[PDB]
C-alpha cells in the first residue's frame, strides 16, 4: 500500500497546484505500467492550462528500437522525450533544457515557471533533476 | 518476464525446470546455505527480485505493434 498515503497525495496535489509544467516520468521497460492515467485525467479535466509532457527515462536499459517505438506510440498522445539520467554520462539533457526554455519563453508574462516531476517511485525523477543541474 | 538466455548469462547457471529448481541451483552455486545445509530460498528470491527491479537483469515489455 506504499505510495497511496494521504500525506504523499497531499504533496502531489501541492506540487501540481504550484507547477506550470508537469513532467510525467515513465520507465522505458514498462511505460504503460508506470503511467498515472487518473492523474492525467484530473489534469486534463481540472487544470487544462498546465502543460503535461512525458519523459521516458532509463532508455539505456532497452534496445534502441524499443525506445524509438515507445516514443513514437506515446507521441500520438503527449510530447514524449527519451532520456537517460546521469550526472556524468547522460542522454537527452540538452533536449529537455531547450524544451524548458521554449516553455519559459511562451510564459514570458510570468516572471518564472515551475516544472514539477511526477510519476511512479524509482522512475528517476531526482536523477533527472540532478542530471539537469549537473550536481 | 525474463529470457532464459539472459537469466543464465546473468547467474552463470542452467539446467532448471521450475522456479524452485532455479532458486536451489543459484543458492548452491552462491553458497547461500542455511545452518544445516538447507538453501536460503527467501534470501535468494529477495536478491533476485532486487536485481530485477534495479536493472541487473535485462528485460522489457514489448511495444505495441506497428501499423
Amino acid at each position: 500500500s506504499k505510495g497511496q498515503s494521504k500525506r504523499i497525495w497531499n504533496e502531489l496535489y501541492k506540487v501540481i497546484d504550484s507547477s506550470d509544467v508537469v513532467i510525467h516520468v515513465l520507465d522505458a521497460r514498462d511505460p504503460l505500467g508506470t503511467r498515472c492515467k487518473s492523474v492525467e485525467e484530473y489534469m486534463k479535466k481540472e487544470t487544462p492550462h498546465k502543460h503535461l509532457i512525458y519523459v521516458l527515462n532509463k532508455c539505456d536499459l532497452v534496445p534502441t528500437w524499443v525506445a524509438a517505438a515507445w516514443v513514437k506510440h506515446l507521441s500520438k498522445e503527449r510530447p514524449t522525450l527519451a532520456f537517460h539520467a546521469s550526472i556524468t554520462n547522460s542522454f537527452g539533457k540538452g533536449s529537455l533544457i531547450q524544451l524548458l526554455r521554449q516553455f519559459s519563453q511562451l510564459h514570458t508574462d510570468r516572471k518564472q515557471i515551475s516544472v514539477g516531476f511526477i510519476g511512479y517511485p524509482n522512475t528517476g525523477k531526482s536523477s533527472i533533476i540532478n542530471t539537469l543541474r549537473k550536481k | 518476464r525474463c529470457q532464459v538466455k539472459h537469466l543464465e548469462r546473468t547467474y552463470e547457471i542452467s539446467g532448471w525446470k521450475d522456479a524452485t529448481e532455479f532458486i536451489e541451483i543459484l543458492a548452491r552455486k552462491q553458497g547461500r546455505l542455511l545452518k544445516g545445509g538447507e538453501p536460503d530460498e527467501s534470501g535468494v528470491s529477495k536478491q533476485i527480485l532486487n536485481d530485477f527491479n534495479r536493472g541487473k537483469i535485462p528485460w522489457f515489455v514489448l511495444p505495441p505493434e506497428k501499423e
Partner: peptide
C-alpha cells in the same frame, strides 16, 4: 521537440547481454 537521435545513445552493457557467459555450450 527537435530531433531525438537515439543512435547516439549507448545502452548499458549488462552481464546478460554478453555471449562470453554462455551456458551449455
Amino acid at each position: 521537440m527537435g530531433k531525438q537521435d537515439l543512435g547516439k545513445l549507448q545502452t548499458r552493457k549488462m552481464k546478460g547481454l554478453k555471449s562470453k557467459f554462455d551456458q551449455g555450450t
